[PDB]
Design a protein around this ligand. Structure first.
Ligand SMILES: CCCCCCCCCCCCCCCCCC(=O)OC[C@H](COP(=O)(O)OCCN)OC(=O)CCCCCCCCCCCCCCCCC
Ligand SMILES: CCCCCCCCCCCCCCCCCC(=O)OC[C@H](COP(=O)(O)OCCN)OC(=O)CCCCCCCCCCCCCCCCC
Ligand SMILES: C[C@H](CCC(=O)O)[C@H]1CC[C@H]2[C@@H]3[C@H](O)C[C@@H]4C[C@H](O)CC[C@]4(C)[C@H]3C[C@H](O)[C@]12C
Ligand SMILES: *C(=O)CCCCCCCCCCCCC
Lengths: 171, 17, 88, 127, 120, 70, 547, 459, 156, 81
């Protein structure tokens, strides 16, 4: 749903690129982007909610008849060339423990530093959940927010997986 | 490669076997 | 891709120049903590242009939500580096 | 709405370790420590023999690669192919066929010794 | 083509049948028609081994050009003197062919212009 | 691995190397040379090596068309 | 004779042993990229040695070194009918890929699968060589399918990519349908005739042969990415440009044409079959190019440029001009391979980007690419005294100078015209114009092989066409007599594209508005063929499968 | 063939009397040696087959299966000891003993020179097969599958048993060689119709033919790795061998009788093939592979042309090697992710580098990559079928096109994509697995060097 | 090892059966609905909108990211068919009803023109070609016994 | 790196066709908010863009210079045999 306000911003954000796609040239697009800007400024001060409902409806059908068949896309996003083009090069962080000691011994700096992640994963384990138990709504969480740590030097609850994720470009 | 150090770790299954 | 590495400090001056290329952003009012809504007086319409300028300045698309919450340069700096895995 | 107070600090809470999670990837200079592996005497000579450099010295190394592969992979199979055809494939009937040579006026044969007639008298056009 | 409409839009009867021709007698309107002497002989063509699509009346001229190519190796352009003979000779056949294309048409026009009064 | 042969730049025109400029322009110069040389040497091929007979100007003199009265 | 025979097959046997180095031996690590390339270097030189004998002496030997099976009254064998086609074609594929192999070292520099790629790149060459030299359907068919397997893997090189997995399958799915016609020939010949080797069919010279040719047309369709079986070719550009250039723009999609040339004797006789071929070639070339004028990504335009060119290749078959169709493919192979490599310069220059709306001004930033992109397009445009002219001009004269279908024949004049319409867009959008590339520009072609590779191909696009056209044997009639407007209708109509295209290019800068055109959306979306087919049929089989 | 029979038998005492911890040691080595000796049967002749005694005989049609058949046995022991390790010695040897017996019950099955003998030995095979699945099956949830086996014997074996015995009284004897000279034309009459069905129906359940295939997919859910491999490697081929065998005495009546089967067979392929796509179960789709494949063999037999039988011989050998490999390949996950769910795990290429190779290498043969034997047979079917009726080409055309779909669907759905995050136990490929798989592709490919042996006596 | 009742069951013939039924699938009874009761007998599994998994936005973080599915979600009956590579129903810029009509017209015209072209083909203003030796009948493997009927081409 | 940046004030619509864009939007009652952003695209030599004819007349005199020498050699050489 995203409430009324967000929809215009998400539409306004998306609207420009397609316009830029048809006009292409920066100076040309910049010209009609201001003309496009001249639109949403007029209806910036609209207050009556039903009045604001009808206007945005038009921006849907109106946009549906202006969209470029081949708009420009950043390669690293859906519709881009570089989407899911380097996923395989990311590797699970949990495969190390199966490493033969020959491979493991090559990296003494790494594992000794890893032990401060597993140790930091387990020593902080018991406390963090208790932080959430009282911070979790009764009968089931209402929303998917994740509260932060609420003490000195406390890890955020459920932090391991997010932090321990790969890098965009590992090699 | 193009800089001193910046040698990134390699994560893989245990290929010794 | 040869070797154009990036650094946390380096992104900072890039952010400012994108913020310097904004006509409305006075050079003397441009700072890391300059909240767009308050310190720079830049509204949602103005902010999107910067984020759009940023998207063309880094070659990565920011999703819808990740452009809304950026109402100061520090969030962007806290945001770009996290996206581009920049650690040093 | 900007990042909420919980959001604002929480990302740094994770971003502290997310970035540090990249720091563990830092590698020791000695890596990848791997066994020396055997070096056959074929390599041993050319490891030092080619370290001086320059145009003259390394072309023979280029020619060596070309020459060694030539015998093993060009001169050997071509020799081998010859024997196969020359004593096993041809000996069978209708094995290797060839479209017969073209015949033109006034050409002499060798097996027979005969000579083809020339062509008729051209009208001597403006040519 | 200007004549194309004269068939699919004009009176196609005068427009010849490009396949069935010659429809009227070859000797029609032409007494003592010469048989086009064939310079190249059946064994010579077999000796040449050319593709039958190339064994038309001007085979003799063509045969020489090919031989020069074989002799001219590595050169290929030497036979231009011989090249200018056959291809320019076939141009005479090319023109001579078009005579069949129209000569039949005029007999139909000749016939039409003759029987029209007979029936009217 | 030559030690950062060319540095990057920020909003500036990237550095141009002498090898590319010499080779590109040397190669670029050679691009149009083959056009002129071939054109002049055998311009016979540009617009038909031989003329085409004018179909409208031919004659019943050689076409063998019987006279109209006949 | 014996030298000619031995040197005929040394090349193939030369390529095999390097592959064995991946099963046995750990001799030379960290050199496979360069190591593999040199085989193609030597392969071209040695292969030309039979060629030069082939040119001078016209020696077309048949070699059957090993017998592999014999069933009752039908005998199989590993025969090598060294004939016109492979002797001249193989050198083209060898050298055309020579640049690609050397170039690919830098293009795929960051890939740890570079050895796998070099390993697999050669494997495709293995298929084509035996495929082209195949003297029999069975031997031919094995390669006829071999490319598909390599085609799938090389298309889906980035196995993480969602579309790449589908895209490789998408190519496969159409490819499978191709063999259906192929097997019919195999079935028809064994059923009616009693052998599959190409020799006996030409020996018996069937009087009535309508059905197997229909299979050949259908089989050629699948491998020729023609109208009806086109949609898969565009989707194969997801892979590396060398994969696209080497396979889907140089040789792989031309196999369907290749066989039709191999079976020229049968198709020609029944002009109805010739009529069948023209209809596909006519409709395909017009549609393929027509969509290219609109598509944004350059590689998409490049792919359709081959697709439109492919139409002429088939069209030449429809007029009983086999060796000429062979020429266009080889001449097309000379430069179209370069274009994608040159376009790769744009792809690598802009940090893996293809959309031309963020391109422009590379004339001074990348003159060398502008010195190489321009050159190849000239032959494609039909410019005189270029590899395209040495076939386009000669063949285009046959397009309207033989018994044809008017409606289909008109499709030829448009095709040549649309060929150059998109070409100015690529150069104008990418090379000329104001700088539209992003702020952080990494325009630096400082790699040796790229410079070296671009050099070598640029030689072929120019010198080869005259050499070949002045060195090929006479296998047809020289058709030079025709009205001058019909003589160079390509030149008359090719320039018309410039006039309208240049007007459009000027109309690009003009600050006038954009209008959604039905002839644009239809042509921009590729005429609804992919989207409608990629959404109708998939539901039917899966949804109805449960029943 | 006593030379082959007895050495297998003594392996049963080998299990009991061997070093308790060396039961896996001796079995493979001792069993393997038998595999090498298996080759000696290949002393075939052009015209006459190889007949030893009044009981046992071998020929081109049965020779490759015998050599193939024994080959499987060591592999089944290999694939099992991981999960049989959980079992105790007192009950562990019970698993090997049954497998050893089934080898005796099989080799003699393909060399029975008397049809009743063939039938007898053939019938007993279900006991080793069933007890293998039932007692030592991972599932014991009362699938109620007794109906199928109840139905099978009622409509299959039992009518077949009576059918055979009826022939012996009339002709005089049921020796397979003897019928080669005393077979008589079987005119179209009501009685022979029923004989024809009983003489054919039993096998169709085991090919399995279309409409009767409901039982096969469920088996691999229950049967452990060992049972599954033999089911498609061996047990399915029994029907084909019998059908190829008994069909010597069904002329000319088989002509009109064939059509109802053929349409099921020809149409069943596309239905069976496309159903592969909707099979959410690894083992089911792997099972479905056999269903469509064998349908080709059936038609080749019914058209009963000299060319066709060559394809079935090649096809029968070809498929069994592949699917038997596939079960272990897919089963290799069941020993890691502890289920048969295809979609659950993905992208095995990164966590198991080599393993994706085997999926690639084996998948090609399934989709008939030339010149592999698979295409040699499958293609031979197309040639022979087309002569029967040109319209048949379309069904073959579509089926092969469909074949590539699932041939690559699992190879895509499992060997690519993001590693499942919550999955964290993906261990490196084991030596047992690496070697065990290699035993399949190698001979399957190496047969391409000398495919002549697997062309049936027709060649 | 899940409880029996926590597995798909017969059609809930009364809302009270739905009230407990939707609890097994965890779905709100308001959206939960079993497929229509008939001989079909799918059970009581959710009758979710028959749509494409692609619809769920990728940038949402799920427990099955590429699958874009949340753990414990009630799967789709045709889920194995609606996955990304399989059946997809992403909206298009142009109407499906119009696009199908537009595409058919394009082809339906193309075929018609070819028939006219094949009913009105092209031929240059020239007659039939001429070949001596009675059309090379003997050179095409003709019969020596029978003399080909002469086809003589005169000068012209 | 330190990565010195160019001065933003250097890139302005003045002296470039961007200026007259502001003129048109100025006439309509508006102004371009990113004119200086695009200025670098038309400054520092980036304004210099060669028209299609220029792409069709690249190095003509360099080609034409040798063209005179190319045909000139034949003219005198033919006289000198
Ligand atoms: C199978 C067909 C034989 C049927 C005989 C049934 C009686 C034997 C039986 O089932 O009891 C099993 C018996 C259990 O006692 P257990 O703990 O294994 O004793 C330790 C032995 N080392 O343990 C046994 O193994 C004793 C039975 C041994 C039978 C096989 C002996 C191998 C030599 C003769 C094989 C005869 C095959 C018939
Ligand atoms: C159940 C019983 C089925 C009917 C069996 C029957 O009717 O047999 C009759 C026939 C007698 O004929 P016969 O002894 O040979 O002498 C006269 C021949 N002119 O018997 C025979 O000639 C030989 C019979 C061979 C064995 C018959 C197998 C019985 C099962 C046949 C039906 C199988 C299918 C049943 C329906 C399932 C779906 C198709
Ligand atoms: C056979 C020889 C082993 C010598 C050694 O290990 O000391 C190895 C060493 C490096 C190899 C060579 C390198 O791989 C590259 C050489 C240059 C060309 O690429 C052709 C192959 C080429 C000619 C190879 C032939 C052969 O495999 C070589 C020569
Ligand atoms: C057909 O192929 C060309 C048709 C072009 C139109 C020409 C119609 C008018 C021509 C009249 C003068 C030439 C007549 C031979």
């Amino acid at each position: 749903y995203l409430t009324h306000q967000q929809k215009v911003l998400r539409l306004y954000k998306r609207a420009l690129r397609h316009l830029e796609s048809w006009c292409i040239h920066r100076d040309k697009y910049r010209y009609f982007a201001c003309l496009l800007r001249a639109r949403f400024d007029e209806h910036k001060n609209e207050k009556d909610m039903v009045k604001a409902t009808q206007l945005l409806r038009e921006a849907e059908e109106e946009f549906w008849h202006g969209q470029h068949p081949q708009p420009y896309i950043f390669p690293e996003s859906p519709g881009g060339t570089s989407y899911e083009r380097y996923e395989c090069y990311k590797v699970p962080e949990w495969c190390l423990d199966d490493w033969h000691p020959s491979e493991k011994a090559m990296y003494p700096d790494y594992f000794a530093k890893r032990e401060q992640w597993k140790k930091l994963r387990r020593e902080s384990w018991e406390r963090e959940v208790k932080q959430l138990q009282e911070e979790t709504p009764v009968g089931g969480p209402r929303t998917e927010a994740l509260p932060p740590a609420r003490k000195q030097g406390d890890l955020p609850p459920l932090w391991w997986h997010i932090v321990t994720r790969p890098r965009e470009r590992p090699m | 490669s193009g800089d001193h150090g910046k040698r990134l770790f390699i994560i893989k299954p245990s290929g010794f076997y | 891709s040869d070797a154009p590495p990036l650094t946390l400090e380096g992104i900072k001056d890039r952010v400012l120049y994108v913020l310097k290329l904004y006509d409305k952003i006075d050079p003397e009012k441009l700072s890391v903590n300059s909240h767009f809504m308050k310190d720079l007086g830049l509204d949602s319409l103005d902010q999107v242009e910067i984020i759009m300028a940023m998207e063309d300045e880094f070659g990565f698309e920011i999703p819808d939500i990740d452009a809304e919450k950026l109402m100061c340069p520090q969030e962007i700096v806290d945001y770009i580096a996290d996206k581009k895995d920049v650690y040093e | 709405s900007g990042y909420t107070p919980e959001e604002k600090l929480r990302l740094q809470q994770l971003r502290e370790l997310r970035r540090r999670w990249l720091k563990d990837q830092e590698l020791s200079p000695r890596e990848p420590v791997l066994p020396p592996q055997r070096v056959s005497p074929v390599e041993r000579f050319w490891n030092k023999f080619l370290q001086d450099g320059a145009l003259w010295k390394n072309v023979i190394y280029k020619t060596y690669r070309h020459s060694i592969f030539a015998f093993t992979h060009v001169l050997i199979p071509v020799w081998i192919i010859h024997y196969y055809l020359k004593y096993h494939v041809t000996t069978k009937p209708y094995t290797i066929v060839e479209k017969k040579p073209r015949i033109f006026p006034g050409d002499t044969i060798l097996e027979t010794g005969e000579v083809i007639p020339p062509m008729k008298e051209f009208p001597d056009q403006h040519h | 083509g200007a004549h194309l409409a004269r068939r699919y839009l004009g009176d196609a009867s005068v427009e010849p049948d490009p396949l069935r021709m010659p429809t009227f007698p070859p000797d029609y309107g032409f007494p003592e028609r010469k048989e086009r002497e064939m310079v190249a002989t059946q064994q010579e063509m077999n000796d040449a081994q050319l593709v039958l699509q190339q064994r038309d009346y001007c085979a003799h001229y063509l045969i020489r050009f090919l031989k020069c190519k074989r002799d001219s190796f590595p050169n290929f352009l030497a036979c231009k003197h011989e090249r200018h003979d056959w291809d320019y000779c076939e141009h005479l056949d090319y023109v001579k062919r078009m005579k069949e294309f129209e000569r039949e048409r005029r007999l139909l026009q000749r016939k039409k212009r003759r029987e029209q009064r007979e029936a009217d | 691995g030559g030690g950062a042969h060319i540095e990057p730049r920020y909003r500036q025109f990237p550095q141009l190397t002498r090898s590319q400029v010499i080779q590109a322009e040397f190669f670029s110069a050679t691009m149009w040379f083959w056009i002129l040389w071939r054109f002049w040497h055998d311009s016979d091929a540009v617009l038909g090596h031989f003329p085409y007979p004018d179909p409208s100007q031919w004659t019943d003199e050689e076409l063998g068309i019987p006279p109209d009265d006949e | 004779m014996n030298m000619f025979s031995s040197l005929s097959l040394v090349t193939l046997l030369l390529l095999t042993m390097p592959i064995m180095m991946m099963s046995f031996n750990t001799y030379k690590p960290s050199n496979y990229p360069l190591y593999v390339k040199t085989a193609i270097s030597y392969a071209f030189i040695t292969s030309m040695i039979p060629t030069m004998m082939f040119i001078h002496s016209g020696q077309e030997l048949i070699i059957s070194n090993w017998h592999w099976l014999t069933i009752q009254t039908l005998k199989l064998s590993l025969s090598f009918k060294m004939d016109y086609f492979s002797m001249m074609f193989i050198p083209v594929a060898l050298f055309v890929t020579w640049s690609i192999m050397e170039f690919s070292m830098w293009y795929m520099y960051s890939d740890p699968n570079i050895n796998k790629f070099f390993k697999y790149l050669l494997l495709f060459l293995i298929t084509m060589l035996i495929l082209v030299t195949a003297n029999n359907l069975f031997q031919l068919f094995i390669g006829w399918e071999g490319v598909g397997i390599m085609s799938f893997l090389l298309i889906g090189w980035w196995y993480g990519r969602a579309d790449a997995n589908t895209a490789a399958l998408q190519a496969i799915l159409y490819n499978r349908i191709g063999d259906i016609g192929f097997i019919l020939a195999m079935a028809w010949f064994l059923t009616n005739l009693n052998t599959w080797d190409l020799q006996q069919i030409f020996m018996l010279n069937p009087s009535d042969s309508n059905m197997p040719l229909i299979g050949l047309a259908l089989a050629a369709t699948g491998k020729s990415a023609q109208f009806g079986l086109h949609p898969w070719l565009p989707s194969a550009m997801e892979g590396p440009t060398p994969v696209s250039a080497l396979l889907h723009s140089s040789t792989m999609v031309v196999a369907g044409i290749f066989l039709l040339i191999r079976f020229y004797p049968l198709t020609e006789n029944n002009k109805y079959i010739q009529s069948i071929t023209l209809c596909l070639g006519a409709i395909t070339t017009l549609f393929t190019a027509m969509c290219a004028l609109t598509q944004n990504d350059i590689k998409k335009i490049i792919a359709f440029s081959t697709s439109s060119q492919l139409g002429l290749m088939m069209v030449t078959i429809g007029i009983n001009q086999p060796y000429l169709a062979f020429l266009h493919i080889c001449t097309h192979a000379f430069f179209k391979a370069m274009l994608f490599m040159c376009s790769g310069s744009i792809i690598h220059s802009l940090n893996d980007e293809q959309d031309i709306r963020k391109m422009g001004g590379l004339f001074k930033a990348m003159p060398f690419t502008t010195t190489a992109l321009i050159v190849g397009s000239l032959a494609l445009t039909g410019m005189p005294f270029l590899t395209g002219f040495y076939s386009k001009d000669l063949i285009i004269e046959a397009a309207n100078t033989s018994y044809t279908n008017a409606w289909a024949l008109l499709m030829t004049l448009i095709a040549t015209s649309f060929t150059a319409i998109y070409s100015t867009r690529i150069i104008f959008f990418a090379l000329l114009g104001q700088p539209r590339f992003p702020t952080l520009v990494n325009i630096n072609e400082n790699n040796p092989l790229l410079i070296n590779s671009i050099k070598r191909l640029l030689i072929g696009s120019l010198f080869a066409g005259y050499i070949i056209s002045n060195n090929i044997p006479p296998t047809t009639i020289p058709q030079m007599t025709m009205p001058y407007y019909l003589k160079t209708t390509a030149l008359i109509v090719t320039i018309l594209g410039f006039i309208l295209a240049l007007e459009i290019s000027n109309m690009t800068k003009n600050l006038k508005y954009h209008y959604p055109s039905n002839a644009f959306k239809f042509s921009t979306l590729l005429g609804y063929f992919p989207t409608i087919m990629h959404r109708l049929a998939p539901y039917m089989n899966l949804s109805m499968s449960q029943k | 063939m006593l030379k082959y029979i007895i050495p297998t038998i003594m392996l049963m005492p080998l299990t009991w009397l061997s070093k308790n911890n060396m039961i896996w040691v001796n079995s493979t080595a001792h069993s393997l040696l038998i595999s090498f000796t298996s080759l000696l049967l290949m002393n075939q002749f052009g015209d006459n087959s190889l007949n030893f005694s009044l009981l046992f005989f071998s020929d081109s049609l049965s020779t490759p299966l015998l050599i193939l058949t024994m080959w499987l046995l060591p592999l089944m022991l290999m694939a099992s000891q991981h999960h049989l390790s959980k079992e105790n010695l007192t009950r562990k040897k019970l698993f090997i003993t049954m497998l050893i017996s089934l080898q005796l019950f099989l080799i003699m099955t393909f060399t029975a020179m008397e049809l009743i003998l063939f039938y007898i030995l053939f019938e007993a095979t279900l006991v080793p097969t069933l007890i293998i699945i039932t007692r030592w099956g991972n599932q014991t949830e009362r699938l109620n599958a007794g109906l199928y086996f109840l139905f099978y014997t009622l409509a299959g074996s039992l009518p077949l048993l009576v059918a055979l015995i009826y022939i012996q009284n009339t002709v005089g004897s049921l020796n397979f060689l003897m019928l080669q000279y005393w077979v008589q034309p079987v005119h179209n009459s009501w009685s022979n119709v029923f004989m024809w069905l009983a003489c054919m129906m039993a096998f169709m359940v085991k090919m399995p033919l279309y409409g009767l295939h409901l039982w096969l997919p469920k088996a691999h859910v229950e049967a452990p790795i060992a049972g599954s491999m033999v089911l498609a490697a061996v047990l399915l081929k029994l029907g084909g061998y019998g059908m190829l065998r008994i069909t010597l005495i069904l002329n000319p009546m088989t002509d009109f009788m064939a059509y109802p089967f053929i349409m099921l067979s020809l149409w069943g392929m596309i239905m069976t093939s496309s159903i592969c796509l909707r099979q959410t179960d690894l083992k089911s789709l792997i099972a479905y592979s056999s269903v469509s494949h064998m349908a080709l063999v059936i038609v080749a037999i019914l058209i009963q042309t000299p060319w066709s039988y060559m394809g079935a011989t090649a096809l029968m050998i070809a498929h069994g090697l592949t699917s038997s490999m596939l079960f272990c390949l897919a089963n290799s996950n069941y020993e890691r992710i502890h289920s048969r769910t295809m979609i659950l795990a993905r992208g095995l290429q990164t966590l198991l580098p080599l393993m994706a190779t085997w999926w690639l290498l084996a998948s090609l043969t399934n989709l008939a990559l030339p010149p592999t034997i698979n295409l040699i047979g499958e293609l031979f079917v197309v040639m022979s079928t087309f002569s029967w009726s040109n319209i048949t080409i379309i069904l073959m055309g579509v089926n092969m096109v469909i074949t590539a779909l699932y041939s690559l669907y699992m190879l895509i759905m499992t060997q690519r994509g993001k590693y499942t995050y919550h999955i964290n136990n993906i261990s490196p490929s084991f030596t047992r697995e690496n070697a065990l798989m290699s035993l399949h592709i190698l001979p399957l490919l190496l047969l391409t060097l000398n495919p002549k042996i697997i062309l049936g006596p027709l060649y | 090892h899940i409880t029996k009742d926590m597995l798909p069951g017969p059609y809930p013939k009364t809302p009270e059966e739905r009230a407990a039924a939707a609890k097994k699938y965890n779905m709100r009874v308001e959206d939960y609905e079993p497929y229509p009761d008939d001989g079909t007998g799918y059970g009581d599994y959710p009758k979710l909108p028959d749509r494409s998994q692609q619809e769920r936005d990728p940038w949402y973080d799920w427990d099955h990211p590429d699958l874009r599915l949340n753990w414990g979600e009630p799967m789709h009956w045709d889920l194995d068919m609606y996955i990304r590579n399989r059946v997809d129903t992403s909206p298009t810029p142009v109407n499906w009803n119009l696009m199908c009509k537009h595409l058919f017209g394009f082809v339906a015209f193309m075929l018609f023109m070819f028939w006219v072209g094949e009913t009105y083909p092209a031929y240059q203003p020239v007659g039939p070609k001429q070949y001596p030796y009675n059309n090379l009948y003997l050179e095409r493997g003709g019969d020596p016994n029978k003399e080909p009927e002469p086809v003589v081409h005169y000068e012209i | 790196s330190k990565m010195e940046l160019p001065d933003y004030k250097q890139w302005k619509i003045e002296g470039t066709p961007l200026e007259t864009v502001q003129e048109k939007l100025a006439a309509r009652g508006l102004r371009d908010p990113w004119g200086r952003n695009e200025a670098w695209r038309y400054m520092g030599g980036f304004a210099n863009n060669v028209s299609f004819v220029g792409a069709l007349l690249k190095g003509f005199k360099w080609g034409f210079a040798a063209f005179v020498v190319a045909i000139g050699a034949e003219y005198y050489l033919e006289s000198q045999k």
